Design a protein around this ligand. Structure first.
Ligand SMILES: C[S@@+](CC[C@H](N)C(=O)[O-])C[C@H]1O[C@@H](n2cnc3c(N)ncnc32)[C@H](O)[C@@H]1O
Lengths: 338, 112
């Protein structure tokens, strides 16, 4: 029912947005998704990389970086480094086996939607950055932010204490105790919208991977479905929350710092309307100027692995396709100027 | 051969309707008539096809005589319940000649 209401709502909205492209997306959302194996750098990545190559999988991040020169600055200056994520070839539907513990009793790799790595890559972490993951749970992107080896400090926040338990489970499974107990990582459970007041102008890089209508998940899971009749108000006020969280992320960013906003929804009301809405709110209410940064070179380099909806005005959007079934992933990089 | 020619006539495969049947299913003159009776019985009382429809099914989809009674019942059910096709359009389209795999492949793709 909620699964059918989600699909009903997506047929109305996404048939208008994508037009003749909507069927290819619709079939992909209603079929098995493609995963990437994010290699754990704490677990001796060279052996894991070699083991994953035996399956005929290839690191899409390395393939992308190789062509960074083709068609300004090194890939490391623009794109977050040391992220190795293996995927099978275009059209291949092979599944990675479950990861096992390795080099330091830590899991060798993390299976995830390969597109979920793009907001982290696009954020462009540099060595020694103070980083904030405002809506971090269950920790997929938090894990990737750590893997870069650039975080001087990493703040991982999420309002839900139950989802934070899953984030702690991933940190215990993937990260050695030396790093996860020190001053390098800090897990909090608080309202992300309040970050403007507490910890303002503090972070170099901020990830705001907001709660959205989780389009693919909403079509599979019936429990805790946002499209349930009781959650009608919660779903309609979702773009308010998303602007509030993005604005809080921007207020916690140092002047000159960068922010990546992202969702796993195809809806423009949750994507471009939130970026424009948060930029206006900061310019009017706080007199802070925020510039959207162009990710066209980033897109063009990663087009070999993902299907992008190139008609995006602000930010970029990975649309699912059977050839590369990487779920809806919207992302926009910004720079706080004043 | 005359005794089978008579069985097929009363079954409605007269008036040159057995042209298509002999091309695909020439075994029909060698088959056991209770195996042919089992197929018409499954279609008439279990799939609720009228006698005129069953005759057209045999004329246009002779393959159903070689089909398993279970596989053939599930194939019919897929059209009536899963796809929502009424008995006349199933017969008119010659749906029962195709494989359940081909049917599932094309129907579910379009559905999704
Ligand atoms: C899409 S999930 C984040 C996924 C995560 N970054 C990952 O890659 O594993 C969005 C999160 O926002 C959280 N959330 C909802 N309202 C919040 C708020 N006001 N402040 C902070 N987090 C909130 C939800 O609990 C949910 O975990």
């Amino acid at each position: 029912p909620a699964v059918r209401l989600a699909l009903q709502n997506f047929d109305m909205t996404y048939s208008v947005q994508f037009g003749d492209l909507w069927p290819s997306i619709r079939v992909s959302l209603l079929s098995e998704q493609k995963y990437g194996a994010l290699v754990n750098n704490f677990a001796a990545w060279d052996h894991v990389s070699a083991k994953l190559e035996q399956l005929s999988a290839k690191d899409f991040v390395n393939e992308a970086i190789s062509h960074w020169e083709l068609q300004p600055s090194p890939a490391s200056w623009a794109c977050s480094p040391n992220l190795r994520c293996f995927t099978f070839d275009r059209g291949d539907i092979s599944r990675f086996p479950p990861a096992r513990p390795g080099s330091l009793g830590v899991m060798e790799y993390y299976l995830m939607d390969a597109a979920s790595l793009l907001p982290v890559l696009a954020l462009g972490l540099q060595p020694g950055d103070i980083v904030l993951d405002l809506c971090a749970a269950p920790g997929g992107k938090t894990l990737a932010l750590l893997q870069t080896g650039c975080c001087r400090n990493l703040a991982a926040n999420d309002l839900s204490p139950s989802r934070i338990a899953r984030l702690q489970k991933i940190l215990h499974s993937y990260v050695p105790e030396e790093i996860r107990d020190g001053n390098q990582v800090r897990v909090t459970s608080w309202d992300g919208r309040k970050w403007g007041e507490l910890e303002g102008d503090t972070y170099d890089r901020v990830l705001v991977d907001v709660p959205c209508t989780t389009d693919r998940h909403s079509l599979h899971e019936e429990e805790n479905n946002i499209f349930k009749r009781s959650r009608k108000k919660e779903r309609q006020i979702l773009p308010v929350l998303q602007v509030q969280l993005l604005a809080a992320g921007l207020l916690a960013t140092k002047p000159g710092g960068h922010v990546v906003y992202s969702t796993c929804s195809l809806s423009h009301l949750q994507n471009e309307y939130v970026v424009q809405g948060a930029i206006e709110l900061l310019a009017n209410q706080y007199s802070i100027q925020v510039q959207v940064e162009d990710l066209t070179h980033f897109r063009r380099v990663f087009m070999d692995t993902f299907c992008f909806f190139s008609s995006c005005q602000v930010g970029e959007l990975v649309i699912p396709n059977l050839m590369a079934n990487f779920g809806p992933m919207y992302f926009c990089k910004m720079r706080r100027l004043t | 051969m005359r005794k089978r020619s008579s069985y097929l006539q009363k079954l409605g495969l007269g008036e040159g309707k057995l042209k298509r049947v002999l091309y695909c299913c020439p075994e029909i003159f060698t088959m056991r008539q209770q195996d042919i009776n089992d197929t018409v019985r499954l279609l008439k009382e279990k799939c609720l096809f009228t006698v005129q429809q069953v005759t057209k099914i045999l004329h246009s989809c002779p393959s159903v005589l070689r089909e398993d009674l279970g596989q053939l019942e599930y194939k019919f059910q897929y059209a009536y319940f899963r796809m929502g096709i009424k008995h006349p359009d199933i017969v008119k389209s010659e749906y029962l000649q195709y494989s359940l795999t081909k049917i599932k492949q094309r129907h579910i793709y379009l559905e999704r």
